[PDB]
Write a protein that binds this ligand. Structure first.
Ligand SMILES: Cc1nn(C)c(C)c1-c1cc(OCC2COC2)cc(-c2ccnc3nc[nH]c23)c1F
Ligand SMILES: [Cl-]
Ligand SMILES: [Cl-]
Length: 123
């Protein structure tokens, strides 16, 4: 079945609202969110709905842009590199579970190209 989703709130974390993290929410994530290919990544993989009973037997550090959005809105991160690491985990999970040429891999590839374009320059 589905595991609990990754945590998005933690009052015990040291938190910051750097200019880069504000940018990652207002510009980077909000632009990726609107991409025609973003919809598979706007929430945790629902292994039950998608009939992927093996997905969480293989992917042990799940992540998605819905989780990232909630983290950013909770000032969950200390710095932009923590947020960028979550993005990279999302893309990498897709490439691990799936194979080149799969539709979902083509979609992640598109999103990742745009992501790298947008983070090349941060405030
Ligand atoms: C494209 C595509 N083609 N086909 C035939 C299917 C079933 C999809 C599809 C649909 C989907 O919908 C998400 C809604 C349901 O709950 C939110 C999510 C994912 C999906 C996301 C992230 N990683 C994945 N690894 C394998 N699938 C992954 C997906 F691939
Ligand atoms: Cl919180
Ligand atoms: Cl902590």
């Amino acid at each position: 079945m589905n595991p609990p989703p990754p945590e998005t709130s933690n009052p015990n974390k040291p938190k910051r609202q750097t200019n880069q993290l504000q940018y990652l929410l207002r510009v980077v994530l909000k632009t990726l969110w609107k991409h025609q290919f973003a919809w598979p990544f706007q929430q945790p993989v629902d292994a039950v709905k998608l009939n992927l009973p093996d997905y969480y037997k293989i992917i042990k550090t799940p992540m998605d842009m819905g989780t990232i959005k909630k983290r950013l809105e909770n000032n969950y991160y200390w710095n932009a590199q923590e947020c960028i690491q979550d993005f990279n985990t999302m893309f990498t999970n897709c490439y691990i579970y799936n194979k080149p040429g799969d539709d979902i891999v083509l979609m992640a590839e598109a999103l990742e190209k745009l992501f790298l374009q947008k983070i090349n320059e941060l405030p």
